Amino acid sequence: GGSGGSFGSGFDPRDISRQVRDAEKKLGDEAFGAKIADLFTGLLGDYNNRDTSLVRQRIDDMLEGLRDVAEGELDLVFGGSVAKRTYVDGLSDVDCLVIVNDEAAGPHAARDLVAKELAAKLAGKAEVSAGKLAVTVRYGDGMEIQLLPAVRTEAGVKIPSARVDGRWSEIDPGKFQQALTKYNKACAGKLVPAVKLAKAVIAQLPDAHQLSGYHIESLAIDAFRNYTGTMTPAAMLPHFFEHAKERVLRPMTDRTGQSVHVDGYMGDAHSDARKTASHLLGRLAKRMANATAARSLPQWEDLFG
Amino acid sequence: GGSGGSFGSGFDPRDISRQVRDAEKKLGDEAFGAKIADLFTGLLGDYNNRDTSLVRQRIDDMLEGELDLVFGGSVAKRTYVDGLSDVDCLVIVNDPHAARDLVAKELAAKLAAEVSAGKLAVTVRYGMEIQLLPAVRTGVKIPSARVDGRWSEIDPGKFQQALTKYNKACAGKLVPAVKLAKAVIAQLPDAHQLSGYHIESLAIDAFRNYTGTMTPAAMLPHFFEHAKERVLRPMTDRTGQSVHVDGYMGDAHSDARKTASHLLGRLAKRMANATAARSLPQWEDLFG
Amino acid sequence: MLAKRRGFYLDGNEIIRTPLLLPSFSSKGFPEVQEIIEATSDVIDGPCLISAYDLHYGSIKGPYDFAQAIFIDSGGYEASKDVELSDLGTMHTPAEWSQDDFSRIIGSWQSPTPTVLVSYDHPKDRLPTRAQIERADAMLPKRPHTFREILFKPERVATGGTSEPPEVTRVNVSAIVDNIGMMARFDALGITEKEVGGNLKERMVNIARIRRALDKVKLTRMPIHVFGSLDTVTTPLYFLAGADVFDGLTWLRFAYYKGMTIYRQNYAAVELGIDMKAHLVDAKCCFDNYRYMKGLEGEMRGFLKEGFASFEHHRPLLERACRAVL
Amino acid sequence: MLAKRRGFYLDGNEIIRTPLLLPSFSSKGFPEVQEIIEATSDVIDGPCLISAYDLHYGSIKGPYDFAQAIFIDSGGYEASKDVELSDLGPAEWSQDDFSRIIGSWQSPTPTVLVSYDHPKDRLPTRAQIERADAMLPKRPHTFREILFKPERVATGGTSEPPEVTRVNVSAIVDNIGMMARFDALGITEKEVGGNLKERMVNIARIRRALDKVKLTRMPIHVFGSLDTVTTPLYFLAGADVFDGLTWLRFAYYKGMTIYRQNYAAVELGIDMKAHLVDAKCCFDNYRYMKGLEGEMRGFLKEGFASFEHHRPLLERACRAVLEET
Numbered sequence A: 001g002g003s004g005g006s007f008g009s010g011f012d013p014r015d016i017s018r019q020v021r022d023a024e025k026k027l028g029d030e031a032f033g034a035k036i037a038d039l040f041t042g043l044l045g046d047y048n049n050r051d052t053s054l055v056r057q058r059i060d061d062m063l064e065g066l067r068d069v070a071e072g073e074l075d076l077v078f079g080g081s082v083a084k085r086t087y088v089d090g091l092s093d094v095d096c097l098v099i100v101n102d103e104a105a106g107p108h109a110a111r112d113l114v115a116k117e118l119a120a121k122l123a124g125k126a127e128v129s130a131g132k133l134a135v136t137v138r139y140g141d142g143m144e145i146q147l148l149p150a151v152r153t154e155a156g157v158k159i160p161s162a163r164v165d166g167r168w169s170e171i172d173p174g175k176f177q178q179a180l181t182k183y184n185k186a187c188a189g190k191l192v193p194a195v196k197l198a199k200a201v202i203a204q205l206p207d208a209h210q211l212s213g214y215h216i217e218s219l220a221i222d223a224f225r226n227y228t229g230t231m232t233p234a235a236m237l238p239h240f241f242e243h244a245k246e247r248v249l250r251p252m253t254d255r256t257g258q259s260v261h262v263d264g265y266m267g268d269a270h271s272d273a274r275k276t277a278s279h280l281l282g283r284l285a286k287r288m289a290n291a292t293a294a295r296s297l298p299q300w301e302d303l304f305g
Numbered sequence B: 001g002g003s004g005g006s007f008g009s010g011f012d013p014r015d016i017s018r019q020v021r022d023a024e025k026k027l028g029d030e031a032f033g034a035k036i037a038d039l040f041t042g043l044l045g046d047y048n049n050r051d052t053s054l055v056r057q058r059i060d061d062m063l064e065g066e067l068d069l070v071f072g073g074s075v076a077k078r079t080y081v082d083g084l085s086d087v088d089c090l091v092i093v094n095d096p097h098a099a100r101d102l103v104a105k106e107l108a109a110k111l112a113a114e115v116s117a118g119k120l121a122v123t124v125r126y127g128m129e130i131q132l133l134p135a136v137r138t139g140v141k142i143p144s145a146r147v148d149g150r151w152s153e154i155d156p157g158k159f160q161q162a163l164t165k166y167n168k169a170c171a172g173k174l175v176p177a178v179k180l181a182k183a184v185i186a187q188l189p190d191a192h193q194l195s196g197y198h199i200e201s202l203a204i205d206a207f208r209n210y211t212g213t214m215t216p217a218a219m220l221p222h223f224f225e226h227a228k229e230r231v232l233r234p235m236t237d238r239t240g241q242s243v244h245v246d247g248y249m250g251d252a253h254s255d256a257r258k259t260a261s262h263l264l265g266r267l268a269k270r271m272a273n274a275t276a277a278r279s280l281p282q283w284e285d286l287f288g
Numbered sequence C: 001m002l003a004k005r006r007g008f009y010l011d012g013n014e015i016i017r018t019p020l021l022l023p024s025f026s027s028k029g030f031p032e033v034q035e036i037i038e039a040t041s042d043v044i045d046g047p048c049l050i051s052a053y054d055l056h057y058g059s060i061k062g063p064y065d066f067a068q069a070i071f072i073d074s075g076g077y078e079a080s081k082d083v084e085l086s087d088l089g090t091m092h093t094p095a096e097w098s099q100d101d102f103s104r105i106i107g108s109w110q111s112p113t114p115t116v117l118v119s120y121d122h123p124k125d126r127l128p129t130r131a132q133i134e135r136a137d138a139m140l141p142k143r144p145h146t147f148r149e150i151l152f153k154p155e156r157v158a159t160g161g162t163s164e165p166p167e168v169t170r171v172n173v174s175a176i177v178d179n180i181g182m183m184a185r186f187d188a189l190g191i192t193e194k195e196v197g198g199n200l201k202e203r204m205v206n207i208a209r210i211r212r213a214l215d216k217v218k219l220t221r222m223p224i225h226v227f228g229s230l231d232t233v234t235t236p237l238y239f240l241a242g243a244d245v246f247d248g249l250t251w252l253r254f255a256y257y258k259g260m261t262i263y264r265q266n267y268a269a270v271e272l273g274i275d276m277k278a279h280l281v282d283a284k285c286c287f288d289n290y291r292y293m294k295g296l297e298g299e300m301r302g303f304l305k306e307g308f309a310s311f312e313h314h315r316p317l318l319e320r321a322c323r324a325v326l
Numbered sequence D: 001m002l003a004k005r006r007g008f009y010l011d012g013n014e015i016i017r018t019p020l021l022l023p024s025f026s027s028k029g030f031p032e033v034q035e036i037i038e039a040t041s042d043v044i045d046g047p048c049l050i051s052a053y054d055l056h057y058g059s060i061k062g063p064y065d066f067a068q069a070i071f072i073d074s075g076g077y078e079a080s081k082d083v084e085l086s087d088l089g090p091a092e093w094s095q096d097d098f099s100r101i102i103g104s105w106q107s108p109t110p111t112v113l114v115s116y117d118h119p120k121d122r123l124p125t126r127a128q129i130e131r132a133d134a135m136l137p138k139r140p141h142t143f144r145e146i147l148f149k150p151e152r153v154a155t156g157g158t159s160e161p162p163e164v165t166r167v168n169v170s171a172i173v174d175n176i177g178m179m180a181r182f183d184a185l186g187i188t189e190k191e192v193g194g195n196l197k198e199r200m201v202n203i204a205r206i207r208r209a210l211d212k213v214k215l216t217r218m219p220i221h222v223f224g225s226l227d228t229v230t231t232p233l234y235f236l237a238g239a240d241v242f243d244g245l246t247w248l249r250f251a252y253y254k255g256m257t258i259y260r261q262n263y264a265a266v267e268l269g270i271d272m273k274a275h276l277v278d279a280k281c282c283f284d285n286y287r288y289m290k291g292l293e294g295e296m297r298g299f300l301k302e303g304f305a306s307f308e309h310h311r312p313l314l315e316r317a318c319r320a321v322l323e324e325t
Ligand SMILES: *SCCNC(=O)CCNC(=O)[C@H](O)C(C)(C)COP(=O)(O)OP(=O)(O)OC[C@H]1O[C@@H](n2cnc3c(N)ncnc32)[C@H](O)[C@@H]1OP(=O)(O)O
Pocket: A175, A176, A178, A179, A182, A183, A186, A187, A188, A191, A217, A218, A219, A221, A222, A224, A225, A226, A227, A228, A252, A253, A254, A255, A260, A262
């Protein structure tokens, strides 16, 4: 025999782990890559083939006549389901911001108002229902348009909170909508699909998930600001969880160090709630890296259900 | 974990070896068995398809012996005559290399067939080669299988008595098995030291009380498995203490007998391992 | 059917899901075990197994929050010169492992993730089967976020002679079945691979006996943990016989490849490449082995829905043995 | 091609033939090694390897006449905490203890004596050649084989330099003309390179050096290599003799060196008596070694068709390490 055979040859075991995982992430199998691309195109099929122009006309057609409700400023049309997740919990799942003027009555007051005035106006044309956050307008063709009720104050517009429900959130809907739209456009329209895929994966977790839809969208903006990887969901989705596992431990901010008021429910920095979220996001990041390294398509399928 | 993991689980290591090797010998593969039978039928093809009736008549046309032999014939491409299992008749002259040179020319007088002399027997080719062992009368004395200028010191009556009776008792498979064994020993790069007479005697002692299958595929391993032990002691019969065939091997358990025992044992293991592995090429290389 | 989805339940909700393949860490045979934990923690997303023996003697120092759950083994493996069926060499002197050392480790263990505590066992401290149940109910604490698992062991201490009787080498399956109603006190049942039978058939039959006994006392969802079994052949076979949790050190000595548990240098030649840097081979083998464990775990979880087609290897053998032993 | 029929020759006649797969016996890891020798002797027809260390301490008793030849290893394996690549885990061994064992050794079969080595008794490469030429006795029926070792003793730190972990291949090639004094050249698997490619190229370097000094039939012995993949690859690279303890821990099956309990499940049967599994694995492994040995001997005539397994891998590596020259 001979002298040698230690696990790390006197190296840092974590440096060896990085060298191995870096070598894995640099080689790819064309067969497994085609299977993964076919998986994501099916999960995003209802989203990329949604009649967005018909959504826009129906929005103008349902708000022309009711002076109280008014369409928002920035065009979203981020409604639409991916991976069979039928939840609306953030700006990435709504089609427009329906702004009412007259606050003190509460978000659920403005929601039911938009609901009632649209259900009477669209009676015999589409069904209207109020949800946990947004009003949904289902039509005969099966199209569901999501409308997020909002109010206008002397301080600006206010969107409902994703968890408190009986209060308005502290987010500036103008800033948020700008970032989500600007990044998505700068992300070849792949940021919003990646966010919905991430929320779909988190939904499959048997564990108790505590992150709101606004905060997940905020985490994605922080993740893909300096993202130089491939513009595919197969590469963008793992980047979100590997970035959010660290970013969720600190209060959310913009580039200059100013609070965006999306992470207040998670307590102070390095709190128990943030640590629990970091481990859940980290286990999903490990499962994604191990499924890709093993070329296991069934493991990627189970992540979405 | 748990208490356990000994090599023999507290048994004798040779008892474990016996249990494993017995279980191997008890299961068989019908495909590999047919492959071996096809090998031996080809190696014994020239012997089993020899016109033995023509051999005796051609012998009577040129002339025989008391006991009928006609054990001549080639097996496994071995063209050697070193014992009674390779001769067709004993040509007896009335009164060693002198009787051989005498018989050779006198056969050319009867026909002018080809006549040639070898190291042990005179060969008469027709185009069929008939092997004739010269002998003289003193009982009879046959030439030694080792030195050219000596007699074998064995009683040719006893030897022929057993070789023919046992062969018949072996359905005529003893002489073919001996020739196969001599072919295997000939392929050994080591120096073969056992005479043709001694090998035939070892086979007689080996296949006495043989209850196995009367096939060369099973008889050939039995010879080497028996001779590895019998060659270590001076050769005898049941009630006689000398056959005068292995005296050249020194005393019992001598260095010469131990070297021969090791060569016969390695051939026995190679045959058992070739069968256990169902390796036809390993059996083929044993014959060349 | 003997194979079923089981696990560890808190308030009727499934906290740990079986069939589960558990990567194990131990100092016995691996003096650099802490370096293995640190490297493999970047790929281990599910539960893993450590030893209270190594926690007490400082062989491992964490952090253990990388895993989904932690199985705290009592320490009877490290406290024993006895090994499992997958040990291929050992040059091991166990130190002292008293009941007080074991109780102090599991008593002070605190973790944000679920924890499974295994009952104490020592090669010199064995009891009758019923008394083993009484010890585990008294030593294992009934605490929040902590499950209780009793590992049955043989009833007789080693004699020290040339051979050892079955009371030393095997657990009393008949006594386990007799006292099977007392298993409601615990969350899981445990037996080592080497001590639940002499060969593969006997181990499968005795596992099936324990499973049928648990299903009769309405413990149809109670997991059976086979300690030491973690390979590509015997682990699926025990799952078809009724077992649920499987751990071992096999992933640290061998390499899983195409349904076979092979020699690592051959795995590096036929899969990793002949020019792979030597300081990365052992960690790459450990990383690939854990991903293989999860793929094999998924095949066992798919057997309940897709049948034998879920297994990618040894399908004729798995079906033949399942018919013969059931 | 780097692969050729070689061996140990007496008066130009082949006494031991290569490629040779050598079943090895050792007390390290096998405390009942004598029990293994007695059982496997009923199936071992060819040569095997034992250790002078075990002969001196009585770990192995014999008799050893069952084998075709005996390779007496010096005892540097048993005297070392260092292990080989196939280990899945020492008393005093002086040079005089080694000289007394090989000095009184008598065997009716051919014997190959290996040069002495100890983890703390290392020398420069040339001094290893001169020490082996002085200690190995020049006797009839005895071959002399030098196992090269690293030139520097272990430092004792967390890392070890290549002068401790690897043999000096460049010094072996430089002093390759001095190999005529011996019958065979020896190198450990772990110490002739860091990975498989480096081990194959360095074996090829030694082979081309031996072929330059007209030692085209001198065997190269890779100590520790005895499996279904690395052994054929070293043979295609220029090596000839292969030994190891893997046949006592693993099981050869369908071209792979596998875990024994799985071999018993897929080949031996799930109900085979447990007290016969360890011996049946050893018996089947030796017959597998002879079948694999024949595949390597057939490569010289039939090419890669002689190999029943890993044909793609064997060709790819063989081309890469021969083009580098
Ligand atoms: S898709 C993968 C490729 N990556 C890309 O982004 C493509 C190329 N695009 C880019 O270069 C960047 O995306 C650019 C366009 C530079 C985006 O940076 P900007 O400088 O344009 O924008 P900022 O995000 O820095 O600031 C704009 C507003 O965004 C709000 N905001 C920042 N961060 C958040 C989070 N986490 N949550 C909510 N809103 C957030 C800020 O409020 C800011 O408004 P201000 O008025 O500036 O405060």
